[PDB]
Ligand SMILES: OC[C@H]1O[C@@H](O)[C@H](O)[C@@H](O)[C@H]1O
Ligand SMILES: OC[C@H]1O[C@@H](O)[C@H](O)[C@@H](O)[C@H]1O
């Protein structure tokens with residue numbers, strides 16, 4: 001079991017860490033059919049999604065996907081500093097797997 | 104996959120972007136039968152709904168309709184500036200499909 | 207579809223609008239059996255309930271009853287000004303159908 | 310239907326009202342097996358629980374138990390003054406049945 | 413029934429108390445498959461997890477695991493002081509079983 | 516009401532957010548004493564002894580900033596809402612106010628982030644006209660509030676026990692035990708005031724942060 005987001009990220013194929021140390025610049029959320037997703041951006045232009053739930057996800061991830069959107073929304077609203085994101089780089093925009101907040 | 108609300112909006116028929124750049128002026132919520140919905144307004148008079156769940160929604164949108172109502176309430180109570188709304192304009196009031204908040 | 211709480215209210219029998227333009231004075235909630243409900247009061251003595259879910263409710267209202275209790279708890283805490291309540295007046299205390307917050 | 314917490318409390322056997330008019334001093338929460346509960350204390354040692362859900366609870370109470378634990382956490386974090394608690398006095402710590410906050 | 417977190421911890425052979433008396437330094441959460449978990453740290457380096465739901469959990473613990481993740485995130489955002497953690501110490505990082513918050 | 520106060524400060528907005536607002540010098544229980552604060556003399560608009568000072572107009576705050584912060588190539592003027600952590604120093608200290616022409620309003624315990632409406636940048640002494648708005652600000656909440664009435668401050672004036680003010684009106688009717696252990700009770704009264712004040716701000720801000728909760732969905 002990983003002690004931190006960097007070690008967690010390294011357990012998966014097609015991932016990478018973004019060290020941001022910044023608050024979220026924008027938060028977008030959609031209820032449109034087949035685009036039930038969230039998108040965040042940072043002031044450096046970096047854009048990330050929480051993917052629409054689909055066949056690439058196992059059942060245990062469904063509640064976690066919903067939690068992640070909750071976490072991004074409140075991080076944005078409170079101007080919480082995001083330390084790092086672990087993301088899948090075989091999606092465009094890159095898809096969030098994990099987040100760490102510090103500072 | 105869209106990277107912003109304007110491109111997301113463009114994937115649907117009967118939609119348009121409203122650019123508000125303003126906090127929500129009023130929040131209305133109903134539990135009355137067949138009117139389980141939310142309505143918001145802006146100080147310019149613009150009025151928007153989150154639709155009662157119905158035949159027009161697929162199953163994947165149900166949880167997202169509930170999230171959107173949560174988002175509007177916290178946006179209202181924290182005076183969050185709304186950037187844009189993507190809405191369906193074949194409904195009165197216009198029906199929210201997506202929201203963006205920036206800053 | 208109604209565009210505001212007054213017009214929504216007029217779609218139902220045994221309802222009326224109370225105009226408060228005031229924050230909630232007290233919030234009470236209960237988990238006691240058959241009294242799983244919320245009660246709010248205003249400084250003018252006005253008292254309102256969110257009804258215990260029962261056979262008088264259709265299935266689609268169950269989530270909305272739960273949302274309304276979330277909204278009242280946190281409106282009380284944030285001292286949000288309640289503009290109007292639409293209530294059923296064939297219950298004592300009057301039972302909340304909808305709420306509008308503004309100003 | 311009661312209009313206040315004292316009259317609600319009186320509808321039940323083995324209950325009493327505690328009048329606190331104080332914020333919560335400590336909040337404890339557990340996910341340990343068979344001890345999925347919350348405990349709160351006030352500054353001079355008065356102690357209350359939200360019980361582990363059990364056979365003593367009807368279905369409608371299970372949902373309200375989850376709500377109550379959220380209410381206590383929110384109240385604790387916001388330093389909100391608790392007015393009264395209605396409790397069952399045949400448990401130790403006394404088991405919360407209802408809470409009021411004013412104003 | 414335990415009266416406080418120390419009593420609670422004592423009901424379990426494979427748990428210990430950590431006394432922190434400090435706010436959470438970092439909050440991490442993941443939606444990655446098989447690592448649907450949260451991790452917190454404190455400034456002294458102490459690292460704790462909320463475990464991925466597994467075969468070692470009984471059904472009554474599932475909702476409590478979700479609540480604990482909710483609790484830690486809001487505690488992190490509000491800089492609430494954590495008094496003690498009760499953890500299972502046959503896991504690395506130590507796995508949270510209960511938390512107490514007091515100033 | 517929606518009245519604003521103003522304070523020049525070299526500490527930039529990112530620092531203010533990280534610090535939770537504009538804090539008094541001794542915070543990093545600190546001494547809280549209005550009389551001591553008001554008499555304090557460097558690189559900062561008065562901010563010692565548990566209070567943070569402001570001006571009642573942008574013009575005044577800018578003029579004060581040019582006296583103290585000239586030689587800062589960049590500094591800020593923070594625009595601050597009125598709320599009951601604020602005392603009109605001249606009203607509370609009366610004839611013993613050490614710098615009455617300054618017309619200062621001072622915040623007991625500093626100025627929380629949410630009370631900061633926004634800020635102007637001052638570059639080489641030149642006020643930039645663009646007001647940057649603070650997302651942590653809450654307009655309905657703070658526009659419903661005003662500064663504390665002087666009656667809430669007389670008992671916190673902080674004069675030494677032997678000071679004649681404690682034997683004069685209005686302070687005679689509000690003297691802490693020992694005044695007229697005096698300094699001990701002044702301090703504890705300030706600590707109590709600040710704790711009670713911060714409870715209200717926490718309730719507002721943290722309640723808003725928890726208005727996302729949807730019970731039914733879980
Ligand atoms: O769990 C979700 C992940 O599933 C993987 O199979 C995929 O390669 C990633 O892009 C991501 O979608
Ligand atoms: O998914 C929701 C949408 O469904 C469409 O079919 C409808 O035309 C829109 O007005 C909107 O309701």
Ligand SMILES: OC[C@H]1O[C@@H](O)[C@H](O)[C@@H](O)[C@H]1O
Nearest residue numbers: 136220262263294296297301
């Ligand atoms: O939807 C709930 C409503 O149901 C009605 O039939 C009843 O008359 C109202 O008092 C209210 O309970």
Ligand SMILES: OC[C@H]1O[C@@H](O)[C@H](O)[C@@H](O)[C@H]1O
Nearest residue numbers: 239323365366397399400404
């Ligand atoms: O509904 C919950 C209640 O159930 C009663 O039977 C019990 O005596 C109380 O202590 C309380 O647990």
Ligand SMILES: OC[C@H]1O[C@@H](O)[C@H](O)[C@@H](O)[C@H]1O
Nearest residue numbers: 342426468469500502503507
């Ligand atoms: O209830 C959760 C606990 O279950 C035990 O069997 C296990 O040894 C602990 O590490 C913890 O996972």
Ligand code: NA
Nearest residue numbers: 516597657660
């Ligand atoms: Na004000």
